[PDB]
């Protein structure tokens, strides 16, 4: 939705053949798509819903406990029974206790002891999968055409449904031709091995397993009027008390004890039908059919004024606005980036063709600047505005910032992140396959370990690198160290 | 959290059994088992560490029991 | 009641030193400054120097540095003041007024004293 | 418990801060100095373990640390 | 707790990481440490809630 | 007998008046006047404006 | 021109009204009325008794 | 009782040859002497009471700029001069500015000129020695009689006046004799080498030499009307506007720079007298003329009855408030001890005669019990009040936690620190002299060193020591290393 | 005066509390510390000084601290 | 406090002389020369520590200055 200043724009530039590009889209940040003699775009993906969800599995949290009972046994004849341990209904748990002339039994020594108890759960947590062919994701697709309210306006926009049922769509932007979108629904977050259960009014998306793994009382989740919990000893404790009697308690309402162990989830939003944010999409471009507006415009020969100062964005980028006062109202806007002491056109344009539309509407021309001090100029003739700017940094700044960021992208995407802007390519193919099988047989090795613990673990294979004689060998745990460190310091985002 | 700081060896011991004594006397073994068989794959890198390490057996046995315990409990 | 009532309308001929007293009574004498303010006779009023009765601190004008000293005497809650060598120009009502500590209250003053005129003539 | 497992470590990593992230990433180191700071007698206990049982200095400060972290987590 | 109690060592129930206050039985208390219970999520980093 | 209470806990937690101040990059931290309330909780975070 | 004034700082200050409230030993910390507001600084001590 | 639960309070007890036992005494704590067959007697110092102040000199913190007059020199001629310079109340710089044709001058470059601006100064501070002639000592001695509402009584007392101009006072006890002070105010403290600087309504006791070398314009106390300063140039700020001209400006109220500074000075009272606090000074106490509250009252023969429960001190003494039940009112109490079914009576009781003296007012009774568990009685017959108490504790953490108290001590005083509980022995005679040459050689050397800056020196000193194969000196530095590591933590008091 | 000569080198000390000490116990380090942060690089350029003149590792970290320590508090 | 952390160094220099420069180049040294001059036997032991310390001479001169640096300013 024309993101400027997000912090997490990803430009992506070039096309492989065939005028597409491969881009992977993610709920945080934008991705910028400029190619040479086409519309800029911001495109990001928006939301992610789940139109129509299945219950597989719904916990408990509190309980209410009823109808304690208790049978007894003098202590050779054996174990007690009570008729209600057959009901499903009751919880309860056989104990030992001493019995005796004072206890009504004959014969002294430690007699069996049942003690059933009702049981029902007055609040539940109702676990719901989701199936992978009744999503939607929303991709939203600005146009970037240098209006004057857009600058990071998250409501303009043109919007795309992606379901697996048709993947491929078309989306019709006004005067630029129609954008076509070949995505890839079906290999986003693998949703098939999560289980986004839903406590009350707040969701999260959880991994399949773990939610299988909860020590608490499930249900078939069949929307039955009368449910059957399964291991109720997890909620009711069983106090022997001094070996003389048995009382039993409920042990309280789980749900502060859950809210923390969902630490590391991934929030969702609940409200209406489930809107999943966090997630990512694959959405490849094919942007055979994009137009520019202005291309068959004149230029324009008056002057232009600045209505609000120039500033830059996160990723260096600056951004103008002007005004035009002339009369031509359709034109273009020159835009000349002169160098510091020379003339070379060292600074491109982010916007393709900036125009003006009308003579008092403003228009927001976004261009990248060279990395010294460079002035910029916006209009025809010595009359001609001339913006003074002075970009900070240096190119081994811009390249260490993209391969951090890089890092990092493949840090949550994982092997996805190696199609990223990837314009075709034949050696980028056999990188991500080799990375696919690297990232699997690391995938096996740490799962489940925690934030301190795979830095840990890091600094391990670090120092046993660094000690071990056998050059492969100590090559091979200092590189798999030091990636274990970056994904301790950058797991849990 | 609360529940990450278990009231478990103290100096109160009576002859009372205490609260949730049985529930409570295996739950970290339990959890530590569940974590182990839903994450085989650990189990072939903690060989591998208390093997480079371990010069003799007792210290690769200790070195491996150790980091069984710590990573799902430190989960 | 909080009020500050003056030593009394003096005469002096020139060239003779004279004692002005301002009486303070009410209130905490320590927390509150004494402005001394002069008015010649039918002319515009004049601020020339405040003391602060908690140090004895004083804050003369810079025409009447020097040729005037305040003093506090902090014990009878009496800011007296006195003119090293009064002059026939020098002729005028001296009043005074009480003010707050901070920077706001420099140039508030309430409750004046009646003022001492001073008549200066051979 | 529930709060014994909690959800790290499992494949399911996005942009988009997890619940309690900040909160949940420095509970257990927390947990662990409180435990340690409360119960400083085990630390010498700790380091006679490591030091019978470590023939070289890696292999000490491997098990110290180790042990350091498994008892409080156990507890 | 509420109707149920424990006895506990002191120095654990000085070391739970739950909000205190004095127990001086005053009408509005004085929660210390309230970041325990309440968690606050940045989202992606361009709201907080 | 008698007890004397030393210490009060709290489980359950309920949260109102929610407010928010936000400042430009370099501007620098953002300042609640209820900051300085101990009723109120809250944290400091980073945004993109 | 046109400075946008932003971070007062006081160079000086006034203190006004000071109240004290102590407990006994065993008998937790000593709250006042006063601590929740936003514009009473104050810090615990312990004292003999 | 007036010091019992003062939580800084320590026991001296035994005597020398003619009864006599000397002591310090600070403002923070009391001493409770008690004796074989001497009454115990709450001593503490209260106040100093210094009078008769001179005021040596007035820094002041605030000026005030007027008069600001100038003149300039053409260039190439003799520097600037005003008669203000020569004035006293004017303060005056020279500077070089440029001076061409349009300044007036014939001839290019730089010129001199000197800007004189008239120094009045609003606030200042005085500070005022204090002539060991006129100090004065005020000591409170409380035998702490049993009696009710007595315990940690600072209104009850029998004050004794010690100073300087004889010293040597006898403080008239009511009932057990009179008490001798034979004490030397000389060595108390070094208020020849301290100022009392009085801001506004505070003060403070600073050394003499640090208040002498303040940043800060001083002039001499003669009381004198329009005082001459000296070094006025500290609050006044001369500014050269790019060589052009220059202009005075005061700097401002500098009180919270020089709160700042005083840290670590101890505040003072200036309120209703100088009242000094803070201070410390040397009795010996001769006890030569003190009595027992008749050691020959008949034993009481009536049981006594609690009526406030019994609470244990700080330092583990029993406070025990019985109240009396017979009718031979005039008696002394019978007391004893046990321990383990076992009369070991070691448990010894403070309060030397526990006499009732009215039958109806209820007495208290200060007691230390044995560090087992100890029934304590009484009574004399089976209507015995028996209290049981158990003192949790260690006879090597007593130890301990004497020998901090005395190095904290030695901490606070110097080599005075060896009088406090002496009877003149020959060995602590030795280990002062030893201590005095050490000290001295040692305060010599840390004069001025910081409260880190002390732990730092002595962590380093202590590796030195460590690495020096002379051991002869590595024992040397590492003791010395140690005494700095404590005395950096314990300084700041 | 100026607050870069503080009172608290005297050998005068008693066991009343004095004047700011809780405050100016701690002030000189929290100042050293916050310079620390702000200048980093100067953590880069004390390193080199203390490497290129001290032989022995004592020699080493008493002339980096002492050099770390001077130019905040000496600035 | 404030005037602890004075605004020197920071990257702002211009033609123009800035505030309280004259005093300010010099309140520094001349506050570590009275310190010197008041505490002499400072310098006996900071000779002690350079000379124990400091193996050659451009070592112990370090030293010796950086400790006489330091220990005023830490005041
Ligand atoms: C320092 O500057 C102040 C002004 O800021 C000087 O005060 C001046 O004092 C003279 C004293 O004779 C005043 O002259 C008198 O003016 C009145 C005006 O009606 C006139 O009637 C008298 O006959 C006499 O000429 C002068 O007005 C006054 N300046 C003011 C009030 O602005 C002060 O003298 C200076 N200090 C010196 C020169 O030492
Ligand atoms: C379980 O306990 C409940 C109440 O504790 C029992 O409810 C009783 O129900 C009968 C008729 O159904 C009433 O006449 C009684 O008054 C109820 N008891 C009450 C209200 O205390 C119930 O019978 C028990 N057993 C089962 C199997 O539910
Ligand atoms: C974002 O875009 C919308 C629509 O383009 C802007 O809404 C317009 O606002 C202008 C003036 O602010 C009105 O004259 C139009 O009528 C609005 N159009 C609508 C509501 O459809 C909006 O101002 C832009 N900026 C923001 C921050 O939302
Ligand atoms: C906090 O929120 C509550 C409600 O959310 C506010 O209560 C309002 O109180 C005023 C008068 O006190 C009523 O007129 C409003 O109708 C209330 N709002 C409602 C009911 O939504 C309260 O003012 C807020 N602020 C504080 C400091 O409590
Ligand atoms: C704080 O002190 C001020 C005065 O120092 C108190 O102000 C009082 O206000 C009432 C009316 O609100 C007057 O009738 C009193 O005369 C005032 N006091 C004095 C000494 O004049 C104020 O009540 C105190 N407390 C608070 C919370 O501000």
């Known amino acids: 939705m024309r993101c400027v200043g997000v912090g997490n724009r990803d430009f992506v530039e070039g096309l492989s053949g065939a005028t597409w590009v491969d881009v992977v889209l993610e709920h945080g940040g934008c991705v910028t798509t400029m190619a040479k003699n086409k519309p800029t775009l911001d495109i990001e993906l928006q939301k992610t819903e789940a139109t129509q969800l299945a219950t597989l599995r719904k916990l408990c949290i509190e309980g209410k406990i009823t109808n304690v009972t208790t049978d007894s046994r003098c202590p050779t004849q054996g174990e007690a029974i009570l008729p209600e341990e057959q009901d499903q209904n009751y919880v309860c748990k056989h104990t030992y206790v001493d019995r005796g002339w004072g206890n009504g039994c004959g014969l002294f020594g430690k007699g069996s002891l049942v003690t059933c108890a009702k049981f029902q759960c007055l609040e539940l947590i109702e676990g719901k999968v989701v199936q992978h062919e009744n999503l939607k994701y929303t991709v939203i697709i600005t146009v970037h055409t240098g209006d004057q309210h857009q600058v990071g306006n998250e409501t303009q926009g043109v919007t795309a449904e992606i379901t697996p049922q048709a993947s491929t769509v078309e989306a019709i932007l006004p005067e630029y031709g129609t954008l076509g979108l070949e995505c890839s629904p079906r290999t986003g977050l693998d949703f098939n091995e999560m289980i986004l259960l839903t406590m009350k009014n707040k969701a999260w998306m959880v991994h399949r397993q773990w939610f299988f793994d909860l020590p608490l009382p499930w249900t078939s989740g069949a929307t039955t009027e009368t449910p059957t919990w399964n291991k109720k000893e997890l909620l009711v404790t069983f106090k022997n008390a001094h070996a003389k009697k048995q009382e039993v308690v409920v042990l309280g309402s789980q749900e502060g004890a859950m809210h923390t162990a969902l630490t590391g989830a991934t929030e969702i939003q609940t409200s209406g039908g489930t809107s999943i944010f966090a997630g990512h999409l694959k959405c490849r471009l094919k942007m055979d059919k994009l137009e520019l507006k202005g291309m068959s415009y004149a230029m324009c020969s008056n002057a232009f004024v600045l209505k609000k100062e120039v500033s830059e964005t996160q990723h260096g980028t600056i951004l103008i606005k002007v005004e035009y006062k002339g009369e031509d109202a359709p034109c273009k806007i020159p835009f000349s980036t002169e160098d510091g002491q020379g003339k070379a056109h060292n600074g491109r344009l982010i916007t393709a063709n900036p125009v003006v539309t009308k003579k008092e509407e403003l228009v927001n021309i976004e261009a990248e600047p060279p990395f010294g001090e460079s002035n910029i100029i916006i209009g025809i003739g010595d009359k001609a505005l001339r913006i003074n700017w002075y970009k900070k940094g240096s190119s081994i700044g811009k390249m260490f910032e993209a391969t951090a960021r890089g890092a990092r992208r493949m840090a949550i995407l994982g092997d996805t992140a190696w199609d990223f802007g990837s314009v075709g390519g034949v050696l980028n193919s056999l990188g991500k396959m080799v990375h696919q099988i690297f990232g699997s047989a690391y995938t096996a090795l740490f799962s489940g370990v925690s934030w301190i613990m795979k830095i840990g673990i890091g600094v391990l294979l670090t120092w046993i690198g660094l000690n071990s004689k056998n050059t492969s060998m100590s090559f091979s745990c200092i590189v798999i160290g030091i990636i274990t460190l970056y994904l301790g310091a950058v797991v849990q985002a | 959290s609360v529940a990450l700081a278990p009231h478990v060896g103290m100096g109160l011991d009576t002859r009372a059994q205490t609260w949730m004594s049985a529930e409570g006397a295996w739950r970290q073994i339990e959890k530590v088992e569940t974590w182990a068989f839903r994450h085989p794959g650990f189990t072939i890198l903690a060989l591998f560490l208390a093997h480079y390490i371990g010069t003799s057996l007792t210290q690769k046995v200790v070195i491996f029991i150790l980091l069984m315990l710590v990573t799902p409990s430190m989960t | 009641q909080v009020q500050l009532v003056q030593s009394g309308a003096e005469v002096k001929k020139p060239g003779a030193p004279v004692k002005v007293s301002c009486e303070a009574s009410?209130?905490?004498?320590?927390?509150?400054?004494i402005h001394w303010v002069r008015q010649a006779p039918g002319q515009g009023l004049e601020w020339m120097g405040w003391?602060?009765?908690?140090?004895?601190?004083?804050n003369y004008h810079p025409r009447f540095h020097g040729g005037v000293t305040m003093t506090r005497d902090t014990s009878m809650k009496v800011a007296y003041m006195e003119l090293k060598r009064l002059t026939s120009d020098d002729t005028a009502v001296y009043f005074c007024?009480?003010?707050?500590?901070?920077?706001?209250?420099?140039?508030?003053?309430?409750?004046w004293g009646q003022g001492t005129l001073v008549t200066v003539s051979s | 418990s529930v709060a014994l497992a909690p959800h790290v470590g499992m494949g399911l990593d996005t942009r988009a801060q997890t619940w309690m992230s900040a909160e949940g990433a420095w509970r257990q180191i927390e947990k662990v100095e409180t435990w340690a700071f409360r119960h400083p007698g085990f630390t010498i206990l700790a380091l006679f373990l490591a030091h019978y049982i470590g023939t070289s200095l890696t292999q000490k400060v491997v098990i110290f640390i180790l042990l350091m972290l498994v008892t409080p987590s156990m507890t | 707790m509420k109707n149920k109690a424990w006895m506990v060592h002191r120095q654990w129930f000085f070391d739970l990481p739950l909000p205190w206050t004095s127990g001086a039985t005053t009408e509005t208390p004085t929660w210390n440490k309230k970041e325990l219970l309440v968690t606050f999520k940045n989202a992606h980093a361009k709201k907080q809630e | 007998t008698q007890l004397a209470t030393l210490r009060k806990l709290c489980i359950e937690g309920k949260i109102t008046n929610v407010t928010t101040d936000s400042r430009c990059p370099t501007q620098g931290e953002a300042i609640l006047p209820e900051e300085q309330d101990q009723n109120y909780v809250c944290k400091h975070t980073y945004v993109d404006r | 021109t046109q400075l946008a004034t932003l971070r007062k700082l006081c160079i000086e200050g006034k203190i006004t009204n000071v109240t004290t409230d102590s407990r006994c030993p065993t008998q937790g910390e000593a709250i006042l009325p006063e601590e929740q507001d936003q514009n009473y600084v104050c810090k615990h001590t312990y004292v003999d008794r | 009782m007036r010091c019992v639960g003062v939580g800084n309070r320590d026991f001296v007890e035994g005597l020398s040859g003619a009864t006599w036992v000397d002591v310090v005494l600070e403002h923070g704590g009391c001493v409770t002497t008690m004796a074989k067959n001497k009454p115990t007697l709450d001593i503490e110092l209260q106040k100093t009471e210094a009078t008769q102040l001179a005021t040596l000199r007035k820094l002041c913190i605030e000026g005030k700029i007027t008069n600001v007059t100038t003149d300039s020199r053409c260039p190439t001629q003799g520097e600037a001069i005003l008669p203000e310079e020569q004035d006293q109340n004017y303060v005056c710089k020279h500077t070089y500015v440029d001076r061409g044709w349009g300044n007036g001058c014939g001839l290019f470059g730089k010129g001199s000129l000197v800007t004189c601006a008239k120094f009045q100064c609003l606030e200042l501070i005085e500070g005022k020695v204090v002539q060991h002639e006129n100090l004065k000592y005020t000591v409170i001695i409380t035998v702490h009689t049993g009696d009710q509402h007595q315990v940690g009584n600072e209104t009850q007392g029998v004050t004794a006046e010690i100073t300087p101009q004889a010293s040597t006072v006898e403080a008239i006890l009511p009932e057990y004799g009179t008490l001798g002070l034979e004490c030397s105010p000389r060595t108390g403290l070094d208020f020849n080498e301290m100022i009392l600087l009085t801001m506004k309504n505070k003060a403070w006791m600073v050394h003499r030499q640090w208040f002498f070398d303040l940043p800060l314009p001083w002039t001499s106390g003669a009381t004198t009307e329009t005082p001459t300063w000296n070094k006025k140039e500290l609050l006044v700020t001369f500014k050269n506007a790019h060589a052009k001209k220059q202009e005075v400006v005061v700097l401002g109220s500098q009180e919270g720079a020089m709160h700042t500074a005083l840290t670590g000075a101890t505040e003072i009272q200036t309120s209703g007298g100088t009242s000094i606090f803070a201070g410390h000074l040397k009795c010996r106490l001769k006890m030569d003329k003190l009595e027992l509250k008749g050691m020959s009252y008949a034993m009481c023969s009536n049981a006594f009855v609690l009526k406030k429960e019994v609470s244990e001190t700080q330092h583990g003494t029993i406070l025990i408030k019985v109240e009396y039940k017979g009718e031979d009112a005039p008696c002394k109490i019978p007391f004893s001890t046990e321990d383990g079914q076992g009369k070991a009576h070691n448990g010894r009781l403070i309060t030397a005669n526990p006499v009732v003296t009215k039958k109806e007012e209820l007495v208290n009774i200060e007691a230390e019990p044995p560090f087992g568990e100890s029934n304590i009685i009484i009574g004399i017959g089976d209507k015995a009040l028996r209290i049981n108490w158990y003192k949790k504790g260690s006879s090597i953490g007593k130890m301990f936690e004497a020998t901090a108290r005395g190095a904290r001590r030695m901490a606070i005083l110097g080599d005075t620190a060896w009088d406090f509980g002496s009877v003149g022995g020959v060995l602590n005679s030795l280990g002062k002299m030893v201590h005095q040459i050490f000290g001295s050689a040692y305060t010599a050397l840390f004069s001025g060193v910081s409260w880190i800056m002390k732990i730092g020196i002595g962590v380093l000193l202590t590796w030195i020591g460590l690495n020096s194969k002379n051991t002869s000196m590595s024992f040397s530095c590492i003791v010395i290393g140690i005494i700095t590591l404590y005395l950096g933590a314990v300084v700041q008091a | 005066s100026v607050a870069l000569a503080p009172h608290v080198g005297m050998g005068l000390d008693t066991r009343a509390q004095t004047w700011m000490s809780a405050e100016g116990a701690w002030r000189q380090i929290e100042k050293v510390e916050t310079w620390a942060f702000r200048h980093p690089g100067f953590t880069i350029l004390a390193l080199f000084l203390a490497h290129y003149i001290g032989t022995s590792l004592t020699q080493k970290v008493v002339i980096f601290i002492l050099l770390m320590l001077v130019t905040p508090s000496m600035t | 406090s404030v005037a602890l952390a004075p605004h020197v160094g920071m990257g702002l220099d211009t033609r123009a002389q800035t505030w309280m420069s004259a005093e300010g180049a010099w309140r520094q040294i001349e506050k570590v020369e009275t310190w010197a001059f008041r505490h002499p036997g400072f310098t006996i032991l900071a000779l002690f520590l350079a000379h124990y310390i400091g193996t050659s001479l451009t070592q112990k001169v370090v030293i010796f200055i950086l400790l006489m640096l330091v220990t005023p300013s830490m005041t």
């Open positions: 007024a009480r003010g707050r500590d901070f920077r706001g209250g420099y140039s508030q003053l309430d409750y």
């Open positions: 009410g209130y905490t004498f320590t927390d509150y400054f």
């Open positions: 003391i602060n009765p908690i140090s004895g601190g004083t």
